[PDB]
């Protein structure tokens with residue numbers, strides 16, 4: 001799979017993260033990210049995707065070593081961690097054709113797994129609108145503990 005790059009943007013209290021909601025197959029909430037272009041450096045792709053999806057330019061805030069990277073079904077997703085962005089920042093995607101909405105969420109309220117269906121004796125997981133964000137939540141909480149505490 002082509003690698004994806006983007007950001008986990010936090011506010012000043014470190015309580016809240018910025019998620020984006022797409023359409024169709026991307027109908028739930030997730031961190032802003034997207035696929036790297038040929039010859040494009042990871043930091044430039046993260047900034048490009050984030051600015052296209054949120055209207056906020058992270059370029060001057062990216063730290064090279066501050067990211068969480070996951071490989072999910074043999075596709076690598078790397079989100080640069082961007083703390084301290086004010087909650088009253090006005091975010092606006094470049095294309096309403098791809099982004100429905102942009103919101104801050106409480107980190108402590110976000111799920112870090114989907115729920116099973118063990119009350120129904122059925123296999124699998126119940127739908128969850130935070131599906132794409134979920135894999136990053138525990139690693140983010142662990143990263144924030146180590147970095148700040």
Ligand SMILES: O=C(NCc1ccc(F)cc1)c1ccn(C(F)F)n1
Nearest residue numbers: 021022025026027028029030131132
């Ligand atoms: O990435 C997803 N959603 C967030 C997003 C939307 C638009 C973007 F441009 C960037 C991120 C996604 C993929 C599959 N699903 C599923 F849960 F519906 N969500």
